[PDB]
Design a protein around this ligand. Structure first.
Ligand SMILES: NC(=O)c1ccc[n+]([C@@H]2O[C@H](COP(=O)([O-])OP(=O)(O)OC[C@H]3O[C@@H](n4cnc5c(N)ncnc54)[C@H](OP(=O)(O)O)[C@@H]3O)[C@@H](O)[C@H]2O)c1
Ligand SMILES: NC(=O)c1ccc[n+]([C@@H]2O[C@H](COP(=O)([O-])OP(=O)(O)OC[C@H]3O[C@@H](n4cnc5c(N)ncnc54)[C@H](OP(=O)(O)O)[C@@H]3O)[C@@H](O)[C@H]2O)c1
Ligand SMILES: NC(=O)c1ccc[n+]([C@@H]2O[C@H](COP(=O)([O-])OP(=O)(O)OC[C@H]3O[C@@H](n4cnc5c(N)ncnc54)[C@H](OP(=O)(O)O)[C@@H]3O)[C@@H](O)[C@H]2O)c1
Ligand SMILES: NC(=O)c1ccc[n+]([C@@H]2O[C@H](COP(=O)([O-])OP(=O)(O)OC[C@H]3O[C@@H](n4cnc5c(N)ncnc54)[C@H](OP(=O)(O)O)[C@@H]3O)[C@@H](O)[C@H]2O)c1
Ligand SMILES: *C(=O)C[C@@H](N)C(=O)O
Ligand SMILES: *C(=O)C[C@@H](N)C(=O)O
Ligand SMILES: *C(=O)C[C@@H](N)C(=O)O
Ligand SMILES: *C(=O)C[C@@H](N)C(=O)O
Lengths: 357, 347, 357, 355
């Protein structure tokens, strides 16, 4: 089978990428771990095999059949076009190539068909978008979607290994040393690139990624724009509010929709339940609903609290939870890689459509 | 038959060189694709056969009969001498050998005769100049040429594959992300070699290549000098303004000429139509004139908007369009290759 | 103060007429917006104030001091003579009246004295012509002008809002939906009212306006004849080739001239630099020259690439760029209006010189 | 007059801080020498008077008017906020507060005016930066400054007293015992806190301080950032290479600039000569140029090798030399204190957290 490279092997997503590949249906002959200079030379396991980490360079992709990128937009912007030139099929986790019409933006259970026409890079959508698409696609299939209003409850792991560590030490300082939450010193959250940083311990930060010109943040607009693209329908109205909360792993979403035809609630539960990747967890009589802590370690997307709006005939509320590192990232990526292998789509692209620097 | 080498087969001209060879009257026994170390190993089709890209090296040219260079004047300056020594005939599609008196500069329809005295290197002319020569030769032949004034509307594909991709994503950022054109970041155009780069998205850049000592660019000076050499007449006045526009493929030219004798338009139209490589597309009553999007894919040079100057007795304006990767490059080069074979000049 | 009417307020030019008036030296007591029945009854902003759009009719001009017209030649032909009978002073943007010797054809920096004999209508010249006049008058003043040869690179905004939208949609269709440029369906360009329409995305269309009996189009003949009228010199030989290119706003011109006496290039640059409305952008050492994207939003006309012909003693080449919506149309009209005000020329005309249709 | 405290009185800069204060115009009623616990109790002289060194504590700044901190970033990090709370005006010779917008970064000849908005802490810039600013400001004033390229030739004194003694013993090991320079053992240079140490004896080490994420060192990036701050212009292009050479004292710089307009050399020379704090030492006919060994003990910045670039219209080369312990540190810091006194700015101010 394949030589498979993981770019960003030492990170939060990369650790999970390693785990998803170890259990993958993909024929792997050789596995390669790529990071920056700081991890080069260091060792990391694949099953029992002992794998030395390689520095990522323009010439690192010779002999590689598939590369999963999860090292940040800059790394992908820099080294993915070279991997393509080399003959790799790239599955990128970052947001860099997502809006490029030459690049499929794929959730396998929803739009696997878009993989066929790939040009050597396939993008794994934003994590909050992925779980929402899993939850919503069986609903659109039957009754259509007019609009989505979403408020998200995002875990810190989506911002990376340092974010996780920053949160754990902040909480430890409050709970163990008696420090007040607003006397904490943050270096990373709400966004690593932005000017100011704020404590997350016992907080809810209504900022993920930086702000755009319309006063929505980038995370908020990614949900809007990625939704329209994955679902292939620009007429679906989408607005989002994305909040960081003190959760390590698993994103949660309060999702409001309006359908095009009225959609009886028990039929909505049945539709979601019967969609691949989606698990109905909805039994309010035994207080059953999706929970972040129960979603961690699972590849499934969990859906509950499903109930019609109190006023809008065609309006429905729900609660959607998934592990942001698995379905939101690594599992979706490994699922994409497996689907490409299955459909004969793991080969070089003759025509190069991504400029180099 | 022949062992043919395509040097720079992965770029914009290279891709079309493959296409033109696939369809040529050249007897090709063996074909080789040469490029940089970054392309070595990778595979490209010649018809149904898979061909593995080799690195351009010193001893790559052993056993090659013909080499078509389309890989940067730098690469022609380095390797063409070794190719020639290895006993190759080189058709160079770069600007390096263009003002060497020992190197013919050839448009087969205009100055085929110049090939007879070749010393192993034949230079394919500048694209903008090629199409102007095809259009103008049948006019010179009959009424002479005193002067040419030309303004060009040049497609981004002339500056390479990466200019294409720069142009497409710039456009996408304006249309898709709502970016202001003056707020875009450019890395290639107007010219890779120059210090500053400017957006081409929704713009017109009056710079192709770098500036010369006299405030005309190298592109403008080529059209002047290469017109004199190809037509073997230094007495023809040629002055040019070269502009990059957001067209992906095909160059367009607003051409102004003064002939030595009054050329009636009906006859000028007829001389162009009859000239090989030139197609008359001129019927203003049904809005017929050459268009850049119509010329892509075609080996012909299309001429129209032909009309007399409103005041100068011997003045004529026209619109000349041609695919810059084809007749302006790969096709002219392959046509040179085919003529060399037919004249027995490949040895 | 004046009552000021903008006819065709809803269009590309009308919209900039609004911008220019908000920033104008004109004493404005009342602003009115007029358009067709399509838009009559809708609303639009003048500064922070809501203005109801009115239908343009024969009786719609009572009380108006100055009326700016930018609504097509037919709307000018039908309603400008009625505004003049009402006592209005008309600044027309269209081609309809430009060649009537009773109508001044004015670029304020060049021939403002022609405004004194006005008879109620003052014509704003063709946009391509305006910019060329700003560039060339300083030259003519010192060394004379024997001939002009011009090739234009014209932006689609010149052909109106619909053309702008056509151009945007075709480009999106090619870049996003993988449509070949020849398989695109045009409806407006090159010429709204001509028999066939062609795509403009990645094209250069050597037609602007319909063709005339001599095989030049009207756009090309406008440049020829408006030049002669504006400069008041029928002996200047002018030929134009006018092309539409995929640019939203700002026209660019490759301009060749032959002067009467030899004009030294360093002196030519200084004469152009010192002319009002004209800005020298000429430093090839640093790749400085006029660019359409930089001229958008500016009321200045930009001149560079200035260089003598390689063979013709008195031949000079240059590159002229201006916003066709501003100096080419709206700003020129507002400048005319402001100068009419300055010279006490805003008042009714006794004797009616334009036919009522 | 003032109660002045010198914090880090026993180091290389601290020792020149004493010399500069003795000859200062600052009125001094009382002086205090502060350092760590291992210096406490020992004595140093101020003029012909003996002074007992005290431990630098979070409370020791009661009654002090002016404090000159030359004891490392973490000492200024710890105790300068407490000094400020205590009503002292601090002149900080270290790099801690340098890019803090509430802290003016001052070379008095260039941007004395920035002193007026101080919040109790004034930062003395990097030594390489100071001399470069003295030499270039008079050119900027007249013909503008577009870009700077600099390669430095830096003395070991810049890395503190231990660096001097390391350099000395390494050289004696080579010269007296015949030790291969590449066989020498080093513990401080190129940078003490970094992992690996290298001999400086008969060497040129292209590393000063630790490396940053852009592969330039912090020293190099100090010159870049601090040039922008001092001249209050982010548009000036600055790129540096900082090198340690076997010189005990005085930094030297090869300096390339491109101005905004053409700056005649005879005029450039005249401008530098007339500029306070800068001496023109430039007579190639008699081989006169700034020299490191001539510069030691002097408060002036010496400039020579002034000549136009062989190609670039607006390019100029020059050689700048100054004592890095004087104008590069202790003199600059006493010049700030004097200017603060002259301007009536020595008074109690509160924008820095207490650790
Ligand atoms: N977190 C999620 O749930 C999630 C979901 C979907 C998409 N993503 C995207 O995945 C990207 C990063 O993943 P993360 O959040 O897991 O970050 P992270 O935990 O900080 O991990 C960063 C990884 O990037 C590598 N890296 C950094 N610079 C590099 C370089 N120059 N060359 C090669 N590798 C480099 C690091 O390697 P070293 O060991 O050398 O530092 C490390 O392996 C982001 O763009 C994010 O938007 C994340
Ligand atoms: N474009 C036109 O219409 C046109 C017309 C007339 C003349 N030309 C001239 O023809 C040349 C290239 O044409 P293009 O537009 O096709 O350029 P392009 O798309 O940028 O491609 C350049 C080609 O040159 C090869 N190459 C570059 N450097 C090389 C090296 N050091 N060693 C070996 N091969 C190297 C590249 O190989 P890799 O892929 O491995 O890098 C690639 O195949 C230029 O000199 C251009 O000015 C172009
Ligand atoms: N485009 C340029 O650069 C430029 C430059 C100088 C002069 N001009 C002249 O300005 C005129 C049109 O401006 P544009 O190019 O900006 O066109 P546009 O965007 O298509 O809009 C045309 C305007 O004309 C109005 N209109 C159409 N029919 C009308 C009628 N029967 N009665 C009243 N108003 C009517 C439209 O109003 P509704 O919204 O009610 O349909 C709209 O306000 C043309 O004559 C053009 O030559 C244009
Ligand atoms: N060294 C230079 O050439 C130079 C040049 C320009 C700017 N600077 C800045 O000034 C600082 C050091 O310069 P230097 O020449 O004085 O270095 P040095 O000769 O190594 O001496 C360091 C001084 O800091 C004092 N110190 C260290 N730890 C202390 C603590 N915990 N509490 C109180 N005092 C402490 C030392 O006191 P003890 O005697 O008790 O150890 C000593 O007086 C550095 O931060 C540097 O950035 C230095
Ligand atoms: C999912 O893509 C993770 C990231 N968007 C975040 O939560 O910050
Ligand atoms: C024609 O030869 C292509 C190239 N000269 C260009 O367009 O710049
Ligand atoms: C200027 O008047 C605009 C219009 N004539 C055009 O560009 O077509
Ligand atoms: C001056 O600031 C001294 C120090 N920067 C050094 O030489 O390292």
């Amino acid at each position: 089978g394949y030589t498979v490279a993981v770019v960003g092997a030492t990170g939060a997503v990369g650790a999970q990428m390693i785990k998803m590949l170890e259990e993958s249906t993909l024929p792997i002959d050789k596995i390669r771990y790529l990071a920056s200079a700081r991890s080069a030379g260091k060792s990391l396991k694949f099953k029992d095999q002992d794998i030395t980490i390689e520095e990522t360079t323009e010439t690192a992709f010779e002999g590689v059949d598939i590369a999963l990128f999860s090292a940040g937009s800059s790394t992908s912007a820099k080294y993915a076009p070279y991997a393509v030139k080399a003959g790799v099929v790239v599955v990128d986790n970052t947001s860099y190539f997502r809006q490029n019409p030459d690049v499929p933006l794929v959730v396998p259970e929803v739009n696997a068909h878009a993989l066929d026409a790939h040009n050597g890079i396939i993008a794994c959508p934003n994590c909050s978008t992925i779980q929402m698409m899993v939850a919503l696609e069986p609903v659109r299939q039957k009754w259509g979607l007019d609009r989505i209003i979403v408020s998200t409850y995002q875990a810190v792991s989506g911002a990376g290994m340092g974010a996780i560590l920053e949160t754990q030490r902040e909480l430890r300082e409050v709970l163990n040393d008696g420090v007040k939450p607003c006397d904490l010193h943050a270096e990373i959250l709400p966004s690593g690139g932005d000017k100011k940083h704020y404590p997350i311990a016992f907080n809810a930060l209504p900022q993920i990624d930086v702000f755009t010109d319309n006063d929505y943040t980038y995370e908020e607009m990614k949900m809007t724009k990625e939704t329209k693209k994955i679902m292939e329908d620009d007429s679906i109205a989408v607005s989002a509010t994305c909040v960081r909360i003190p959760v390590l792993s698993a994103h949660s979403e309060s999702v409001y929709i309006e359908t095009k035809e009225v959609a009886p609630i028990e039929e909505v539960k049945a539709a979601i339940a019967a969609f691949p990747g989606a698990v109905l967890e909805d039994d309010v009589a035994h207080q059953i609903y999706p929970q972040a802590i129960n979603a961690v370690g699972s590849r499934d997307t969990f859906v509950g609290r499903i109930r019609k709006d109190l006023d809008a005939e065609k309006g429905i509320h729900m609660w959607v939870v998934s592990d942001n590192l698995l379905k939101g990232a690594a599992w979706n990526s490994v699922q994409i890689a497996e689907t490409l292998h299955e459909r004969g789509l793991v080969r070089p692209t003759a025509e190069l459509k991504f400029e180099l620097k």
